[PDB]
Amino acid sequence: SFVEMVDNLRGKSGQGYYVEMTVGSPPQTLNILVDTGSSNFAVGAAPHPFLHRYYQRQLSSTYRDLRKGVYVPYTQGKWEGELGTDLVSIPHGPNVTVRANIAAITESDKFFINGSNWEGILGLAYAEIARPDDSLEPFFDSLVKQTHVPNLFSLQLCGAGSVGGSMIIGGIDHSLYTGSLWYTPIRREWYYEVIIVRVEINGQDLKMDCKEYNYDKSIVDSGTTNLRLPKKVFEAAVKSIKAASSTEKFPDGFWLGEQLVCWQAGTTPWNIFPVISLYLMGEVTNQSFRITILPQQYLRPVEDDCYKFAISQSSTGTVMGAVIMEGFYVVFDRARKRIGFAVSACHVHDEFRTAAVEGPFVTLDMEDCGYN
Numbered sequence: 245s246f247v248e249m250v251d252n253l254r255g256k257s258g259q260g261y262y263v264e265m266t267v268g269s270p271p272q273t274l275n276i277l278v279d280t281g282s283s284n285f286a287v288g289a290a291p292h293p294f295l296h297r298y299y300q301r302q303l304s305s306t307y308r309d310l311r312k313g314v315y316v317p318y319t320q321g322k323w324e325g326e327l328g329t330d331l332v333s334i335p336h337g338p339n340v341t342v343r344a345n346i347a348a349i350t351e352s353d354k355f356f357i358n359g360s361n362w363e364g365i366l367g368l369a370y371a372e373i374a375r376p377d378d379s380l381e382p383f384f385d386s387l388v389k390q391t392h393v394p395n396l397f398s399l400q401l402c403g404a405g406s407v408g409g410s411m412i413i414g415g416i417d418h419s420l421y422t423g424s425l426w427y428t429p430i431r432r433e434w435y436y437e438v439i440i441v442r443v444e445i446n447g448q449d450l451k452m453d454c455k456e457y458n459y460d461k462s463i464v465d466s467g468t469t470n471l472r473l474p475k476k477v478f479e480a481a482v483k484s485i486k487a488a489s490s491t492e493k494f495p496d497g498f499w500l501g502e503q504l505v506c507w508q509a510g511t512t513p514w515n516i517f518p519v520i521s522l523y524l525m526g527e528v529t530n531q532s533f534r535i536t537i538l539p540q541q542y543l544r545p546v547e548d549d550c551y552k553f554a555i556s557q558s559s560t561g562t563v564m565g566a567v568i569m570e571g572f573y574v575v576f577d578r579a580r581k582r583i584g585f586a587v588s589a590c591h592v593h594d595e596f597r598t599a600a601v602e603g604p605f606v607t608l609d610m611e612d613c614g615y616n
């Protein structure tokens with residue numbers, strides 16, 4: 245649901261995906277990063293070395309001040325600014341205009357990125373995690389309350405098939421995937437929180453208490469680049485990934501996500517890097533499904549062929565970031581408290597292996613896999 249939004253995303257590797265928006269009357273055009281890992285809609289509203297444009301409130305006939313300040317601290321970066329409401333629309337989007345909350349960003353630190361082409365962020369997760377508090381209605385919530393747009397969006401993030409993709413607001417576009425959608429419950433409405441019931445690398449169960457995979461949570465987050473795994477899980481995965489690829493040897497800064505590794509163009513040894521299967525809780529009792537990630541997703545290319553290890557240690561739970569979401573079509577079915585995965589039409593290539601969404605699997609005591 246529908247052709248107008250196909251290919252409405254762009255970006256640079258490791259700097260997120262953005263969609264074109266306009267705010268104010270007359271309309272001012274900004275590129276906005278699409279972030280299911282937070283819930284604030286915020287935009288450059290003042291000069292910055294890295295911004296090529298920004299939101300000019302005084303130039304907008306429709307702007308209203310909320311006379312209240314705001315700040316948001318992300319994993320690394322943070323911004324603060326001023327709350328208002330203005331009229332907002334997505335040009336390659338549904339055909340509508342909403343009055344939404346906007347944080348006019350006045351100061352920032354390590355937020356905007358030099359390469360960038362985006363001037364703001366669209367937090368698509370739920371009011372619970374919004375700043376300054378849950379009474380600040382998120383953008384998707386206002387678009388739903390104010391229009392007829394169904395309460396569902398879908399993200400097809402593609403990986404260089406200078407990245408691109410689609411954000412279908414309001415529905416599912418059957419032209420963007422193959423095979424069956426498989427759905428996992430949204431465990432609680434705050435982040436897009438899910439439960440991982442099993443983990444296998446090259447078909448070997450990690451054999452951990454399934455609570456460790458969700459410790460203290462597992463989320464789907466398009467605003468975080470890497471797959472981020474709890475310490476105990478990170479250690480076990482890097483252990484098997486090391487051993488699968490031991491034929492060759494790598495700097496330590498490589499496994500820590502720091503320094504790139506290189507091979508002669510067209511000779512990257514993909515076969516020595518294992519596939520990772522994440523099993524998600526399903527819709528029916530004792531039933532789950534798996535997504536399989538290929539090394540082409542977790543060895544993210546940096547500009548010979550050169551890559552960073554795109555899995556990292558977490559102390560805040562599992563993060564399924566952009567590299568996991570790439571080559572899947574991921575449906576955020578808020579209306580039904582579920583997230584659907586299918587093989588995307590921009591799926592990642594290997595000459596001998598494929599990324600897959602497969603089910604059904606039987607898995608006992610999936611309830612026990614949730615932390616607390």
Ligand SMILES: CC(=O)N[C@@H](Cc1cc(F)cc(F)c1)[C@H](O)CNC1(c2cc(CC(C)(C)C)cs2)CC1
Pocket residue numbers: 259260277279281282283316317318319320321322354355356357373374375435463465467468469563
């Ligand atoms: C890398 C990163 O941090 N990405 C930002 C998006 C981003 C992209 C970018 F290019 C630059 C940034 F500074 C931020 C994304 O929201 C991360 N989502 C999560 C967190 C959100 C928050 C804020 C709350 C929800 C507590 C208010 C803290 S961790 C769950 C992990």
